[model samples]
Target: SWEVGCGAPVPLVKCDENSPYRTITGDCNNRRSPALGAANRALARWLPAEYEDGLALPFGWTQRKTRNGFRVPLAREVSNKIVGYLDEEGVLDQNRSLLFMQWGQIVDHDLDFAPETELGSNEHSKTQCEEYCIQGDNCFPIMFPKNDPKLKTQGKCMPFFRAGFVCPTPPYQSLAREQINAVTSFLDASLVYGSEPSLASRLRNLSSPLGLMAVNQEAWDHGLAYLPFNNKKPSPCEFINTTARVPCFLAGDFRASEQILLATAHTLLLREHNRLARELKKLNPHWNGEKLYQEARKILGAFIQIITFRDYLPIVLGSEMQKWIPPYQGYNNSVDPRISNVFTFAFRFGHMEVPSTVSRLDENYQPWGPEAELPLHTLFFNTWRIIKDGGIDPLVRGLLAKKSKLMNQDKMVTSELRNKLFQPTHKIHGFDLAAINLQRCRDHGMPGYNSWRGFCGLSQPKTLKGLQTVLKNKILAKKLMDLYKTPDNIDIWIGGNAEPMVERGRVGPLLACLLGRQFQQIRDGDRFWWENPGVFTEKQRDSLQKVSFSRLICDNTHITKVPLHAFQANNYPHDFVDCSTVDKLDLSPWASREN
Candidate 1:
């Protein structure tokens, strides 16, 4: 009754019918609200889960809430005890590149879309644990335990946002006692392309002579959606906003400009969309706006796939899994590529790599100015900062040179992220990302850490010492034992991220496996999976495949010279190479098929 079928005009249905843009069926995923140029938002939601996988779990992998005997751990407490260990003096690991964190987030934004609705904080709304984690002298109460000694009473916590989806009818419903709402139950690219019609339409410039939204020469070719920047006016939730100006960032997903790095990546894709559209228009002058748009979008999707499985993913997941992911297999209609609970929580592991700093460098690789670096706490939720700064160039260059927070042991999470995650630029009222992540996991009722290990084909040790194989640091393992009663009680998000990384490997086995399989399913299940036959012509495919990170940066930005691999931590060729020398996408392949 709700779906309007792509862009077909809606017929008048019953007045009492549920006219909504939110649906788990991946129908309205692209179009959440009736807002203009909001199609990208919908597109992202439905895009992955092109999820468009919400695939069920592996055999014997039951939901945690379903089990009768084992107890579920408090996600917030687990976060308080562990996660987000930050040391400002922390140094860089030459191997871990800034691009890893950058692309990791871009990819993450693609598949996962948790329901952060108006439900408010489940901690306060659902329970009476107010006195549990109080601040100094009754200042304000917190969700997690208090480690800081000087703080007075805690303030009101952030409210819990509700998930709109429901679960199964029988054995599944019975086991999962109270309803569970894990948004990304499948592995799809909802964020990049969008999942529903609202965002998908918002992303499109319907009246344009060509397809979809194109690049704006002004914003350094940063991809701006066709819709106006609809961010809440005078919004200061990130910290404090004393100005009346609203920002416009039309990247396919709403969260595109949330961070400088993510924004940079978003700019590349948005610009690429316009780039392909322009060329496609030249090749086929007779094609209508719709035809040109779809063709361009297809190539855009194809280019994304190349960057995803072929490039971005290989570094995060194990190299072996890369061998298993196929390319251009054509579309598989019967495939189910929904996001899974395992991949949903496991992907949060990237938080460990989030540093508490945002920096900008000059052409010479030195800090840009006195404001070259700023504490992340100060930069939280502020998109204008990126604009006010010398545009995206410094940030684009800085990420290339900056070292991300290392995973596990020495430099896990940073205090800036923990104590002042959403802090205002000049204010101190920021919330904690660590606590929010933990609380969020518990909100979804995710399973214990050991359970995922078993599913990922690793042994689940009963004792803490045996767990060392996955965690490496025995001291940390013992700490886990001290905190959680049993390995079964440890939350997967925490342990999944902390488990020791394989030698010369970026992600541990559990994370790599979960992420890899999810991605593979996305490709196999997506009929238009760019590389798939019939999606694009052979020449078109060739040109799309030629797109590269270095090329993207060169095409869209003011600065030019960069090394061959934009995702690399080193610059053996040069710290910043000439933009002219960088490789580019060969759009000639997309030339007009007619005449």
Candidate 2:
């Protein structure tokens, strides 16, 4: 049916059964005629009252009979009802709604409710509260009303606020409870066994193996699935990204975990070694055997390698498989060639010289020196240089350059590679570089440029004695000092003479002075002999060298420092060479001031 639009009547067109319009009887366009529109506009005024019928009665509704015999209330009257309902509901409560609506004779208005008068002052607490809400398992938005004068006059003192709510489920509740119990139990046990020295000592070292297993299980479950979606197939090493690798290690499935772990372990060891090396130079100026051993133990903890394996390997290889794989590699080639190149270089360098079966290279090319004779630092440095400067292949150089560009736009090599390359070098070097330098002087050879035993001052005592006599002579000291301008050059002489005598317990105080000089040389970054020495005690200084030197020659606990007060109590206050203090101290006199 159709009605007349402005003037004349229009006939409604009916679709026949065969017509396509028969199935589409509803209004094609939802637009209403003027009369229909007017009627709808009229209905809007009454809709709110109808919707709220069961909830509560609206205020001031003066009903009247219209010409069509329908009951109606004025729009103003309806607005009043809504205002009254809001006031009665106590929506101003902070825990409830935060909105306040007001009804005037002509128009309606709304305002937010503020329970606390000081609104702006609460910003800090509000931010903290928001952070708490974000960390919560189930949280909802909460609104606070601002204090506006307009809202008060209209009897609308409250603000309206709405938020979605979520209740805690069983799993989350149980997890929280378990964490609480574990912490409480651990605290209780620690307190209970506080007096039992043996039990306490054992407990100190008792790590949560179960926690490790759980982590492994988690890795096994989620590692592979997290890989990014891509059109291209992932590399064979993609398996390292999967969660399966974590538990695989714990489950004794070393083959898969080993590859991932080795790559990760190698990376971490480099970083740790560099960090320790830097720190050691700062602490022990005249680094002795004890100092070297103690610093090494402190910096490179017993579980450092193992813990890194557990924590970072999975995260580095498994979680970031996408970043480590093809697209990234391709990107590395184009944008950041250095990254891929460095990794490729490392892989190739490690892989080459190997037979088809085993991954390690032949014994001759292997970075690990002879089991009986630890490789010296010089050998390690030379090997690294060989690998870097076209030792394995030309492809390595290209790859490293590409990786470097991608990582740093400035076309500079990154610390990552430098750190990585240092580990195998460190292991081969055996003793600290500074210590090696000192040892070398005893043999009249350059530091890190000769054998360990030769540097220990044992090869030729007569030759060392002659050199010592020359060093002690004021005329010779002055001549040598004039020849060598840098502390590093002076250090070489001191270290060479001092390292050997200290090793054989021949020159006690002289060894200490030489060790101090070595420590100073390390602090100046001329060379890193031991790890952070500023933190070591005298006993630790002695222990470090003895243990490291002994370990170099033969593996045993005899040279190792034990947890006794006598050894540990040597508070080497002299080792504290504050770099900050040095920075403040004016050294202009030492520098050649000529512009």
Judging by TM-score against the true structure, name the best candidate.
1
Q: What TM-score goes with each of the models?
A: 0.78, 0.16
**Candidate 1: tens digits of C-alpha lDDT, residues 62-180:** 32432224534344455556664535565555666677777778777666555443232333533332333332211123333455321344544432332222322213322221222
lDDT of 2 at 582: 23
Model 2 poorest 10 in a row by lDDT: 102-111
Alpha carbon deviation, residue 104, candidate 1 (Å) = 1.1
Clashes of each: 97, 58
Q: What is the lDDT of candidate 2?
A: 0.20
User: What TM-score number comes out for model 2?
Assistant: 0.16
Task: Return model 1's CA RMSD, one decimal.
Answer: 8.1
What's the lDDT for residue 412 in model 2? Answer: 13
- Count: clashes, candidate 2: 58
